[PDB]
Structure formats: C-alpha cells, structure tokens
C-alpha cells in the first residue's frame, strides 16, 4: 500500500530516492573529511611571546657572545665595584651597567663585546681600532635620551609607557639598516621619500585649499598610504572617512607628535648642515616603518621602568 505509485512502483522513479540519499551522504562526507584534515594537520595559530623588557622582541639566544668576554666580565666587575671613566651612564654600579650592556646594547644589535670596546680593559677609550664605534654608541645614547625626554613624554598614559632603545631602530642588526625596503614600496613610486621639510601641523592639508591641485593630493595620498603600511589598521586608524580634517580619533595628535619627532631626527642627527660631515647615521633618513615595523607599538620598544633612569623619559 502506497500513496505515490509513480515513485514507489516504477524503477525510474525508484532510482531517484537512492540518488538523492547518495548525493546528501557524499556532500556531508566530503565536507567533514576536508575540514577534519585541515584542522588536524595545522599548527597552533597564536603562540604568545613574553619578555620582561621588550615588546614582541627577543634576545635569549646569545650565541653571538664569544663566551670569553663573559669570562672577563666577572673579573672586571669584581675588580671595580663602581664604574670608571663613564660620561653618560650615571647613578648605576658596574653590575647594573653590565646587565644593561648585555641585555640592551648587545641584545639590540646582536654583536660581541669586542665590537665596540676592548675586553681586556673595559675603560679604555682610544687605544684600539674600535674607538669610533664606542663614540658613535655614546652619541646614539644621547640621541635616545633626547628623543625619550622631548617627544615620548608628550603622549598620554593611555598609549602606555614604552621607551625607545637600541633595538627599536636596529632590530638585531649592527649596520646596514633599511628604511624604505622594497616590500613596503609596493603601490608607491620606488624613489618616494617622506617630505621632512614641511611643518606638519599644516604640512599635508589639501581640503578646500584652492591654491593646490591633484598633484598635492597625490603627494598627500602617498604619505598617507605609507602611514597605513607602517601599521596594520587601515585608513580609519587615525581618521573618520566622512570628514578627513576632523580631529576626533585621538591617534591623529599622536601622529602629529611622531611627525615632529621624525623631522627633529632628520634635521639634527641624520644631516645637520650636511649628511656627510657632522652627522651620525651615515645619511639615512628616518621612517615610520623603521621603528613601527607594521604594528601600533614598535617591537623594539621597551616596557616602562626598564631603561636606565638617565635615559628614561622621567629621570
């Protein structure tokens, strides 16, 4: 007894039931098997990184140390309880200065102790072929202190209390730094650089000016896309797209302070009256990507209270 003779009596209509059941089973099986295979052979997505000083930067593998400088380190420290012939690092003992050198100076550059100053007598100044490196390091420390105490202190406590250290700009390389690498020059012309000769409180304003045209807007767009790439948050990170001139997102004033800081770095250290003479950094202009490296907070930034108080924003 049936109510559908055309479906439960004839072979042609009787085949459709099995066909549909097989189709459903095949679809379910294929979906389940693909997703099981995908979720079984994939690594753990997000491994957190913890480091008591750096923000997403590491120096624990220290194979770059020759292991004999560490041997002389303890002998020096035992010989002299207090530092001798120190001109910048003040208020610290030899043990604290050695810890700073091991973790910060060598951790941030990935170089041996003999790179800058002699292991035999750590207090020597110009008796070895590496005195110039130590002088450049002292100038770097003074520059870092200036940058910390003049610009980072203006940012609100909401952003945090991160400081600037060697690893912020070096990121594990002694030399040959690459501001404006090829991977970040994707959509832009290959020879574009930040316009560091303008006054940024009004440098890149184009809205309704009527004394500019599409070329100035193009330059503004190049700068804005560079600012996007140096982070990973898109064009709305500092803006409201309904009205660009508005100051309401609270990361646009931070960008103003950052721009003024970059201009100061360009005009005081990169090339004061000539990049070749009287200028550290070998004539390399600064960039947002140099420190930020595609993140809101630079990976080389140090957590609050980590750097020495002499170099801190609040000495």
């Amino acid at each position: 007894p049936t109510l559908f003779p055309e479906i439960t009596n004839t072979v042609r209509g009787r085949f459709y039931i099995v066909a549909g059941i097989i189709s459903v089973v095949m679809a379910v099986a294929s979906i389940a098997i693909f997703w099981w295979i995908f979720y079984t052979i994939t690594p753990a997505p997000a491994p957190p990184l913890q480091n008591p000083i750096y923000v997403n930067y590491t120096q624990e593998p220290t194979d770059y140390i020759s292991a004999e400088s560490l041997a002389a380190m303890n002998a020096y420290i035992q010989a002299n309880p207090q530092p001798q012939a120190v001109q910048v690092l003040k208020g610290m003992t030899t043990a604290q200065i050695s810890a700073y050198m091991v973790a910060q100076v060598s951790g941030g550059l990935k170089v041996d102790c003999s790179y800058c100053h002699n292991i035999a007598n750590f207090a020597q100044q110009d008796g070895y072929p590496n005195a110039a490196k130590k002088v450049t390091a002292r100038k770097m420390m003074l520059m870092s202190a200036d940058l910390n105490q003049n610009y980072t202190a203006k940012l609100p406590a909401s952003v945090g209390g991160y400081q600037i250290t060697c690893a912020t700009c070096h990121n594990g390389k002694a030399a040959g730094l690459e501001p404006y690498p090829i991977e970040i020059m994707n959509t832009l012309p290959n020879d574009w650089r930040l316009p560091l000769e303008l006054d940024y409180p009004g440098g890149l304003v184009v809205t309704g000016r009527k004394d500019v045209s599409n070329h100035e807007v193009e330059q503004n767009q190049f700068a804005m896309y560079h600012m996007n790439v140096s982070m990973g948050q898109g064009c709305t990170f500092c803006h409201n797209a309904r009205y660009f001139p508005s100051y309401e997102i609270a990361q646009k004033n931070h960008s103003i302070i950052m721009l003024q800081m970059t201009k100061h770095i360009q005009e005081t250290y990169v090339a004061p009256g000539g990049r070749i003479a009287d200028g550290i950094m070998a004539g390399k202009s600064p960039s947002c990507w140099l420190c930020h490296q595609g993140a809101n907070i630079p990976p080389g930034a140090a957590k609050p209270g980590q750097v020495p108080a002499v170099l801190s924003s609040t000495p």
């Binding site: 049936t2 439960t8 009787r14 039931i17 059941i21």
Partner: peptide, 26 residues
C-alpha cells in the same frame, strides 16, 4: 559522553533509513 550519544543517534538514523527503504523497495 558526547561521542557515545553521537554514535547512538547515528545508529538510530541508519536503522530507520534502512527500515523505511526496505519497506518502500519491496
């Protein structure tokens, strides 16, 4: 105890499907 219940419902579904197919396919 979730996998045991999953097996139970799957077995019940298979048995019901086979029984109704045999009823129709005869």
């Amino acid at each position: 105890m979730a996998p045991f219940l999953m097996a139970f419902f799957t077995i019940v579904l298979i048995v019901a499907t086979l029984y109704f197919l045999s009823m129709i396919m005869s």
